[PDB]
């Protein structure tokens, strides 16, 4: 599909521990539907490289669904981005 408007995301459920060593989150999108979600994460101070290990394959906002995202992050101080919506994520070491 087309790329979801980076300015039209809000947190329905902010990033949180899943209980099975992943990070889960849910967003509400307010642009055209359906669309394909740009999601990424950066190690603080290094915005060039996406450190997110996405488990959710091809995350997509559907007309009546979508917005759940599951990922894994390297230890340290990270920032998660869904479009331009952001949330800090400290990832505990192994």
């Amino acid at each position, epitope marked *: 599909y087309t790329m979801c408007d980076k300015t039209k*995301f809000t947190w329905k459920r902010a990033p949180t521990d899943s209980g099975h060593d992943t990070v889960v989150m849910e967003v509400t999108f307010s642009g055209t539907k359906p669309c394909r979600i740009p999601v990424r994460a950066v190690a603080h101070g290094s915005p060039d490289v996406n450190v997110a290990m996405l488990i959710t394959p091809n995350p997509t906002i559907e007309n009546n669904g979508g917005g759940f995202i599951e990922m894994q992050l390297p230890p340290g101080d990270n920032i998660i981005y869904v479009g331009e919506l952001s949330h800090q994520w400290f990832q505990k070491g192994s």
Partner: antibody, heavy 120, light 108 residues
Framework: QVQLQQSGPELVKPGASVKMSCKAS????????IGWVKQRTGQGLEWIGE????????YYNEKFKDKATLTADKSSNTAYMQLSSLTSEDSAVYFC?????????????WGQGTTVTVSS | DIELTQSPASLSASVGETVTITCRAS??????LAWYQQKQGKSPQLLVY???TLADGVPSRFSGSGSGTQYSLKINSLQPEDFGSYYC??????????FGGGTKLEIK
């Protein structure tokens, strides 16, 4: 050049419904949002809602969800707003305006407005 | 919802002078603030988007600034066509895309 041509003024009874149109020309219709804005005489602007003509996706201001219905016709490059159960609080100028689908951060051209007057 | 509070409500100035009006957001809108001008009995005209970018055709005496929740529109060297009402609007994250209450700029 980009033009949004709106339909003519309506003078109607309380309880009637009106359907107004916004015909787009000068661009590709389905690449742009059409939003709708209300303005009472001497007062400010209020966002009613918007439609993405390419996908049919709509968004409504909670205050207008039982009042406005937004539709679009790709073949005629036209957006429509229907207002139901009109009261004197609905008397206002209604604008349509254009935003960019996929990076919607402004209403960048505006129609000339359609005046709806509810009267006895 | 995000509320936009515009200030001053009205002001009177003379051609050639400088004026500044502001729009305060109740929450972070990430600079996604648009400014419009509307003259008496006319349609609003886009002046500024993303808080500092002038729209096509807008002369350089207009300038937008601001961030977080406080934004400013500055008009240098006022011209007769600059008079009217000015509105701000935000497009961050989730509707409603609310407008500020408007500022009325009129001749002295």
């Amino acid at each position: 050049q980009v033009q949004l041509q709106q339909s003519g003024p309506e003078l109607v009874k309380p309880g009637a419904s009106v359907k107004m149109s916004c015909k787009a020309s000068g661009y590709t219709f389905t690449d742009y949002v059409i939003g709708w804005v209300k303005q009472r005489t001497g007062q400010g602007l209020e966002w009613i809602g918007e439609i993405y003509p390419g996908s049919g996706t709509t968004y409504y201001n909670e205050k207008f969800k039982d009042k406005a219905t937004l539709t679009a016709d790709k073949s005629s490059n036209t957006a429509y707003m229907q207002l139901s159960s009109l009261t004197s609080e609905d008397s206002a100028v209604y604008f349509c305006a254009r935003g960019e689908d996929g990076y919607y951060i402004a209403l960048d051209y505006w129609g000339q407005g359609t005046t709806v007057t509810v009267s006895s | 919802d995000i509320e936009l509070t515009q200030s001053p409500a009205s002001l009177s100035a003379s051609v050639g002078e400088t004026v500044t009006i502001t729009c305060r957001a109740s929450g972070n809108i990430h600079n996604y603030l648009a400014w419009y001008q509307q003259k008496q009995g006319k349609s609003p005209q886009l002046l500024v988007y993303k808080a500092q970018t002038l729209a096509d055709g807008v002369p350089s005496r207009f300038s937008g600034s601001g961030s977080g929740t406080q934004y400013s529109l500055k008009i240098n060297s006022l011209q007769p066509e600059d008079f009217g009402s000015y509105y701000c609007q935000h497009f961050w994250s989730t509707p409603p895309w609310t407008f500020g209450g408007g500022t009325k700029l009129e001749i002295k």
